[PDB]
């Protein structure tokens, strides 16, 4: 066989130990999901320092909690905007998931509250910036560098999928680098509790699995496809399927064809062909062996999955950090004033927030 007796016994034991972990993690998540947090701070508890990012729903700002001096990232969502953008259920769901999950590579929600006009999700500040910016800046990550990040996504998806959460919006834009060089997954606006199948067309074109594009009822294997896209993009500097317009990207994705840079190792290419596998019955992460097909793949032979989870691996890259409020790793955004209307907007729609 590929493993001798000591290796196989060690590997099987480790696999049962993570099953034991996930079982306990699932119980703690459900208990938190049934009894969630609410109204745990207020706006004047924070100084607003700088906008770190923007989106259709609102803005994310670096804030400083006045009492403690601690910095946080405060996501501000315009309620009326959220309605018009038909994002009520996503936003409520994201906040509900964020307060219920617990994993070292998932951003932690520290406070949440609302006022007449806005919803506020106060998350840990992740000062290293988006993986996106570093990837485009460096050009591409070495395979060990890409592997270090990929390993954390694998563990994170293993965790989320054990909670029956499909993530569905993996991309470097969504992955922040913390001070130790580890990954923080943010943005759960498309995550959903799915034990079986789900049908929503959602995600980012380059990262859509074929079965999403083809309007099938799909499952958590779309996350493993997206992992393949992420690994490819991290290691190549560009994603496997690109084109001027999303429709042409989709034609490439469903085509079953993928080309690799010549500098890709064969181990890497083998993993990618098994993740970027259009046939759901052959895609890694979707077979009887589950995530173990990925974690035991030759490309991950050097990965100490436990050490990664415990964050005992020295990161290949540590972002420039010049203090707790440093925003140098984030781009600059036009600053809009936070106006809290006198009239409560959309009170019914966000009652549970």
């Amino acid at each position: 066989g590929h493993m001798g007796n000591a290796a196989a016994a060690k590997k099987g034991s480790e696999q049962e130990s993570v099953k034991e972990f996930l079982a306990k993690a699932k119980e703690e998540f459900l208990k938190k999901w049934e009894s969630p947090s609410q109204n745990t701070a207020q706006l004047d508890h924070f100084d607003r320092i700088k906008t770190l990012g923007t989106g259709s729903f609102g803005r994310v700002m670096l804030v400083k909690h006045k009492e403690t001096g601690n910095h946080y990232a405060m996501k501000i969502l315009d309620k009326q905007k959220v309605v018009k953008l038909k994002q009520i259920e996503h936003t409520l769901n994201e906040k509900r998931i964020l307060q219920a999950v617990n994993f070292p590579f998932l951003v932690k929600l520290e406070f949440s509250f609302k006022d007449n006009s806005n919803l506020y999700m106060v998350m840990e500040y992740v000062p290293g910036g988006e993986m996106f910016s570093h990837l485009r800046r460096i050009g591409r990550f070495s395979e060990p560098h890409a592997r270090f990040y990929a390993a954390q996504i694998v563990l994170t998806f293993e965790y989320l999928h054990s909670l029956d959460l499909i993530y569905r919006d993996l991309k470097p834009e969504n992955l922040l680098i913390d001070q130790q060089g580890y990954i923080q997954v943010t943005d759960f606006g498309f995550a959903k509790r799915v034990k079986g199948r789900t049908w929503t067309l959602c995600g980012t074109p380059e990262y859509l699995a074929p079965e999403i594009i083809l309007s099938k009822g799909y499952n958590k294997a779309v996350d493993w496809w997206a992992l393949g896209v992420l690994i490819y993009e991290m290691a190549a500097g560009y994603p496997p399927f690109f084109a001027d317009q999303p429709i042409q990207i989709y034609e490439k994705i469903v085509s079953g064809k993928v080309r690799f840079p010549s500098h890709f190792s064969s181990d890497l290419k083998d993993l990618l062909r098994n993740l970027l596998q259009v046939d759901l019955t052959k895609r890694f992460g979707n077979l009887k062996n589950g995530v173990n097909d990925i974690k035991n793949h030759k490309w991950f032979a050097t990965t100490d999955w436990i050490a990664i989870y415990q964050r005992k691996v020295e990161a290949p890259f540590i972002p420039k950090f010049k203090g707790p409020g440093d925003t140098s790793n984030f781009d600059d955004y036009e600053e809009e004033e936070i106006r809290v209307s006198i009239n409560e907007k959309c009170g019914k729609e966000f009652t549970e927030f």
Partner: peptide, 19 residues
């Protein structure tokens, strides 16, 4: 090159989810 095609695609910046 494939990288040049990636540049020519114009989708080198931050990518939005579909809407």
């Amino acid at each position: 090159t494939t990288y040049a095609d990636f540049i020519a695609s114009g989708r080198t910046g931050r990518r939005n989810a579909i809407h």
